[PDB]
């Protein structure tokens, strides 16, 4: 039985939020003892999964770099399985994987609107968790493909349910957050409520918890469709609603998904992952 004090030291980063009102640590560089955690999880022989979708030109623009960086930085020292979801397997970049890495690849149907491509991921992930992921890993992370690992993204990020603080709003007040504000939407979060603004580019936890996250989020996505409304930030709006109602047991600082367009302020000590520059004119086909 692992105890928070065994690996997490919030006093190492006193200038930032390291603990939520419901506890749950906010993992910042310097606060975690990866050595302790690696030993602990290794003795449990855990396996970590990672899902990533690449539909359309996202394949050529980002899949190879994402996979290459993940192979080098994601849960090094532990068995990892990459679940690649593409609409065209013939364009699948097959890179050489290193020790403790392996993958499988699935062909999925490409949604017409990029907004649905992004949102339908919630449905697909759920189907795969029930079909096989629940039997193959102990923890699973679901990520956007348009980003690249820059440094070790390890076991210090594992937990029941894990959320990512969005790089651009981590210092803002809830009323500034771009939550969906229309009551007609299932993702609606009224002003006066909210803890943080989570990035949908990264989320995870145990297969069971991620299954519930994706389910619920997808149900909200379907509900909105029946009410002829679409959340402002699509799956992200819904994810934030979910995490408001079901608090994550662990949150990652913006160091784990950083936007260099912001520059590199004092709080961001060591970047583990960074956003790829947006290229919508090429990778997206509809407004
Ligand atoms: O045409 C599309 C739209 C989205 N995606 C996937 O859905 C995620 C969400 O999209 P995007 O990264 O474009 O969202 P943004 O972070 O720029 O809001 C992407 O990382 C991809 O994994 C995709 O493969 N093809
Ligand atoms: Mn993205």
From Swiss-Prot:
Organism taxonomic ancestry: Eukaryota, Metazoa, Chordata, Craniata, Vertebrata
Cellular compartment(s): Golgi apparatus, Golgi stack membrane
Cellular component, GO annotation: Golgi apparatus; Golgi cisterna; Golgi cisterna membrane; vesicle
Entry keyword Glycoprotein: yes
Membrane topology: Single-pass type II membrane protein
Annotated glycan sites: 212
Function of the protein: Synthesizes the galactose-alpha(1,3)-galactose group by catalyzing the transfer of a galactose residue, with an alpha-1,3 linkage, on terminal lactosaminide (Gal-beta-1,4-GlcNAc-R) disaccharide borne by a glycoprotein or a glycolipid. Preferentially glycosylates proteins, can synthesize galactose-alpha(1,3)-galactose on glycoproteins but cannot synthesize the glycolipid called isoglobotrihexosylceramide or isogloboside 3 (iGb3).
Reactions mediated catalytically: a beta-D-galactosyl-(1->4)-N-acetyl-beta-D-glucosaminyl derivative + UDP-alpha-D-galactose = an alpha-D-galactosyl-(1->3)-beta-D-galactosyl-(1->4)-N-acetyl-beta-D-glucosaminyl derivative + UDP + H(+)
UniProt pathway: Protein modification; protein glycosylation
Enzyme class at the top of the EC tree: transferase
Cofactor mode of binding and number, as noted: Binds 1 Mn(2+) ion per subunit.
Keywords carried by this UniProt record: Glycoprotein, Glycosyltransferase, Golgi apparatus, Manganese, Membrane, Metal-binding, Signal-anchor, Transferase, Transmembrane, Transmembrane helix
Keyword Metal-binding: yes
Protein name (database record): N-acetyllactosaminide alpha-1,3-galactosyltransferase
Organism: Bos taurus
Binding site for Mn(2+): 144, 146
Membrane-side (Lumenal) residue stretches: 1-287
Family named by the database record: Belongs to the glycosyltransferase 6 family.
Positions spanned in the full protein: 82 to 368 of 368
GO molecular function, one term: glycosyltransferase activity
């Amino acid at each position: 039985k692992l105890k928070l004090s065994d690996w997490f030291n919030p006093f190492k980063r006193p200038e930032v939020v390291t603990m939520t009102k419901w506890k749950a640590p906010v993992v910042w560089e310097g606060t975690y003892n990866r050595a302790v955690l690696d030993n602990y999880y290794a003795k449990q022989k855990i396996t970590v999964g990672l899902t990533v979708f690449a539909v359309g030109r996202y394949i050529e623009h980002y899949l190879e770099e994402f996979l290459t960086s993940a192979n080098k930085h994601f849960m090094v020292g532990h068995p990892v399985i990459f679940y690649i979801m593409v609409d065209d397997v013939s364009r699948m970049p097959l890179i050489e994987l290193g020790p403790l890495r392996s993958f499988k690849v699935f062909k999925i149907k490409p949604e017409k609107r990029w907004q649905d491509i992004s949102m339908m991921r919630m449905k697909t992930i759920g189907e795969h968790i029930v079909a096989h992921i629940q039997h193959e890993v102990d923890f699973l992370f679901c990520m956007d493909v348009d980003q690249v690992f820059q440094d070790k993204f390890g076991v210090e990020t594992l937990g029941e349910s894990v959320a990512q603080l969005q790089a651009g709003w981590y210092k803002a007040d809830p009323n500034d957050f771009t939550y969906e504000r229309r009551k007609e939407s299932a993702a609606y979060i009224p002003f006066g409520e909210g803890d943080f603004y989570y990035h949908a580019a990264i989320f995870g936890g145990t297969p069971t918890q991620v299954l519930n996250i994706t389910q619920e989020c997808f149900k909200g996505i379907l509900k909105d469709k029946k009410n002829d409304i679409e959340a402002q930030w699509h799956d992200e709006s819904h994810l934030n609603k979910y995490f408001l109602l079901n608090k994550p047991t662990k949150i990652l600082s913006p160091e784990y998904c950083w936007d260099y367009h912001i520059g590199l302020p004092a709080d961001i000590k060591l970047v583990k992952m960074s956003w790829q520059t947006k290229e919508y004119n090429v990778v997206r086909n509809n407004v």
